[PDB]
Design an enzyme around this catalytic site. Sequence first.
Site, short mmCIF file in Angstrom:
data_model
loop_
_atom_site.label_atom_id
_atom_site.label_comp_id
_atom_site.label_asym_id
_atom_site.label_seq_id
_atom_site.Cartn_x
_atom_site.Cartn_y
_atom_site.Cartn_z
N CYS A 1 54.24 35.97 39.99
CA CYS A 1 53.34 37.14 39.98
C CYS A 1 53.92 38.23 39.05
O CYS A 1 55.03 38.70 39.29
CB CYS A 1 53.17 37.61 41.40
SG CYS A 1 52.34 39.20 41.46
N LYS B 1 48.07 32.31 52.84
CA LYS B 1 48.80 33.50 53.25
C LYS B 1 48.98 33.49 54.76
O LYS B 1 48.09 33.12 55.49
CB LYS B 1 48.05 34.79 52.91
CG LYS B 1 48.09 35.19 51.44
CD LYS B 1 47.15 36.33 51.19
CE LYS B 1 46.85 36.41 49.72
NZ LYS B 1 46.01 37.58 49.33
N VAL C 1 51.03 41.10 46.97
CA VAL C 1 52.45 41.39 46.61
C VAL C 1 52.44 42.24 45.35
O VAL C 1 51.47 42.18 44.58
CB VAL C 1 53.24 40.08 46.42
CG1 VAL C 1 53.37 39.36 47.75
CG2 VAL C 1 52.68 39.17 45.34
N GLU D 1 51.78 48.47 46.13
CA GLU D 1 51.32 48.74 44.74
C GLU D 1 52.57 48.75 43.86
O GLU D 1 53.48 49.49 44.12
CB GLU D 1 50.45 49.98 44.53
CG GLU D 1 49.69 49.96 43.19
CD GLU D 1 50.47 50.27 41.91
OE1 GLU D 1 51.37 51.05 42.06
OE2 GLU D 1 50.28 49.64 40.79
N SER D 2 52.58 47.86 42.88
CA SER D 2 53.72 47.60 42.01
C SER D 2 54.28 48.89 41.45
O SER D 2 55.51 49.06 41.52
CB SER D 2 53.37 46.51 41.03
OG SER D 2 52.44 46.90 40.07
C1 LIG Z 1 50.81 38.80 42.31
C2 LIG Z 1 49.71 38.29 41.34
O1 LIG Z 1 49.87 37.27 40.68
N1 LIG Z 1 48.68 39.11 41.15
C3 LIG Z 1 47.78 38.77 40.18
C4 LIG Z 1 46.51 39.26 40.23
C5 LIG Z 1 45.61 38.95 39.23
C6 LIG Z 1 45.99 38.24 38.13
CL1 LIG Z 1 44.92 37.94 37.12
C7 LIG Z 1 47.28 37.74 38.05
S1 LIG Z 1 47.83 36.71 36.65
O2 LIG Z 1 47.24 37.55 35.61
O3 LIG Z 1 49.24 36.44 36.74
N2 LIG Z 1 47.23 35.39 36.66
C8 LIG Z 1 47.57 34.45 35.55
C9 LIG Z 1 46.43 33.42 35.35
O4 LIG Z 1 46.11 32.85 36.64
C10 LIG Z 1 47.19 33.10 37.62
C11 LIG Z 1 47.34 34.64 37.92
C12 LIG Z 1 48.18 38.03 39.06
#
Ligand SMILES: *CC(=O)Nc1ccc(Cl)c(S(=O)(=O)N2CCOCC2)c1
Lengths: 239, 239
Positions: free
Chosen positions: B30, B57, B70, B83-84
């Site tokens: 993530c 989850k 997360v 929130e990051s």
């Molecule tokens: C923690 C997390 O991964 N949040 C999150 C929310 C939305 C998106 Cl789009 C992503 S991502 O951009 O990493 N995404 C990559 C392509 O598909 C998997 C997740 C992450």
Amino acid sequence: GESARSLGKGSAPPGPVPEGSIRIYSMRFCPFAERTRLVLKAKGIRHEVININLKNKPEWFFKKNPFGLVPVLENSQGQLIYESAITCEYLDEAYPGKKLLPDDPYEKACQKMILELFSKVPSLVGSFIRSQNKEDYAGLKEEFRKEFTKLEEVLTNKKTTFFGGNSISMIDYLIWPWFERLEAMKLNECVDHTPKLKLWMAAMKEDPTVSALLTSEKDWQGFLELYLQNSPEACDYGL
Amino acid sequence: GESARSLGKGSAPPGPVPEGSIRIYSMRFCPFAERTRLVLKAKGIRHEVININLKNKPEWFFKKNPFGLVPVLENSQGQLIYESAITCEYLDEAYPGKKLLPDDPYEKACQKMILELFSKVPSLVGSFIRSQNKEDYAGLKEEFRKEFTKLEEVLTNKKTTFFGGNSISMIDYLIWPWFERLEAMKLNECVDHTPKLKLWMAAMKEDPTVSALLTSEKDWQGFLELYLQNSPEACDYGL
Ligand SMILES: *CC(=O)Nc1ccc(Cl)c(S(=O)(=O)N2CCOCC2)c1
Ligand SMILES: *CC(=O)Nc1ccc(Cl)c(S(=O)(=O)N2CCOCC2)c1
């Protein structure tokens, strides 16, 4: 006064901000810019205001903010700060008086997490503009009620007057402008299943800062009808 | 280790966080949670990690964060922060070591304004998932190039190695995760008209904190193919 009239396309670029003052580029009915103006008033910060005609913007305004959006702060040193929440944070940090954000890192993160609970509400104003009939209105009221229940839960858990405690603080000023506008949008009944949130609106309207900046329903309707007709004169409604 | 395996539906609620440590609820791929983990490493903060299976989850995770997302921080006092960007800010304030955000209110607002320049880039990951063919790919590359030109302008004006100066700071860690993933998404060529941004990526990959957390292209592809097949096993790719 006519002194509040907006600067639009063809206006001269304004001069430097005098030492001892900060300038806000605002618009008198913009709820984002109202955030900054509530903070300026609550901390007693000497300032000047330049209103921008957001339907008929001066090309020089893109030198203040490349996004072309209010609010923007400009100080005597020539520094430019934009995005409403960033302007408010900057003012609380840079100036003396009432600290509107807590010093404690956790309590400060709580205020920002509440701001995050609120984050869907402003985009619901676009939703309101696109609502054309009673069916759209019923669906719009439901959307507001599901965001408002999230805010009700915070007040239920804290049992405080305000989102940050028993004293009004930054988070209350950051969400107030949208609650101020609910009556004018005919969305006042969206707080009827959120009793603490409804008492919080009554407490806000008593705050000296809020009361000093509050716009009448008649004034916000005059603005919105011109803003909806797409009028260059909307921002100067009443002047 | 298998120690990094995710907790999913049916897992026991975890015990209290020990005094002297903070816990992050994360997921190893993530990019939002990676922000928090870069800050924890850069400041040398003792911590434990609980990975969450975001496809499967635990119901108890909604007690950590009602949004179910997360990252989440939990400390020995039981306080929860999510929130990051809020987690990162909280860590910089609450712990000693390298200050990643400037003390100066203006320079701190600048970092947040750069974060705002970046704010369209994460939603472009959804855009990437919906891209199915060469035509969609060409349009996706154009969208990335117009956001990247905004970031190039900041580096052009400052003539610094990094977004906050000659030393790496908070803003660099807050945007890095998405640049880390460009090679794996086949979007590396979106930085070819942004020369300072391309040198900034090379400087980031040399930072000890970045290098310590970097994931290989092979690992991110393994994750994405399972995350795209909708696999409960995606988050545990490699374990
Ligand atoms: C923690 C997390 O991964 N949040 C999150 C929310 C939305 C998106 Cl789009 C992503 S991502 O951009 O990493 N995404 C990559 C392509 O598909 C998997 C997740 C992450
Ligand atoms: C400064 C400003 O007004 N910004 C802004 C941006 C978007 C929206 Cl939607 C608004 S609004 O919600 O005040 N909106 C009310 C309905 O139509 C007028 C503007 C404001």
